[PDB]
Amino acid sequence: GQPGRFGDIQSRTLDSKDLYANTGLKLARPAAGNIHVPYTQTPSGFKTW
Amino acid sequence: NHFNAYKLTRPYVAYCADCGMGHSCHSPAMIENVQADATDGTLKIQFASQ
Structure with missing residues (x-):
């Protein structure tokens, strides 16, 4: 799931309580x-x- | 029509990024969310007072 295109997060159904994500998230300092x-x-x- | 859950809590202040005039301040009237998510085009706003 390369971020930004389709399929950036996903799950097998509505309740698969673990889920894939590759959203490139990073946090900086204020x-x-x-x-x-x-x-x-x-x-x-x-x-x- | 009773709304009892709110009665425990109060409003609060925050650090607003645009207090008018482009000068930062603290305000009891900030705004944090948009969450449109409808189809007709309404909007919900979660702003920090009650």
Whole structure:
């Protein structure tokens, strides 16, 4: 499931309680002062398809 | 029509990224979500007050 194209996440049925994902997710460090959390990944490719 | 679950909790403040005028502040009126997910084109907004 190369991220961004079709099939970026999947599961055998509606209830297979473990699921595949290769969404390229990674998180960085915040800038000073404000409390938050940054993170980067390609958006949900299903809506792109 | 009773809504009792809310009564335990209160609103809260957050760090808004656009408080108008392009200057960052803290606000009791931020906004975090969009989640359109409909077909007619409505929108749900989960903003940090009650």
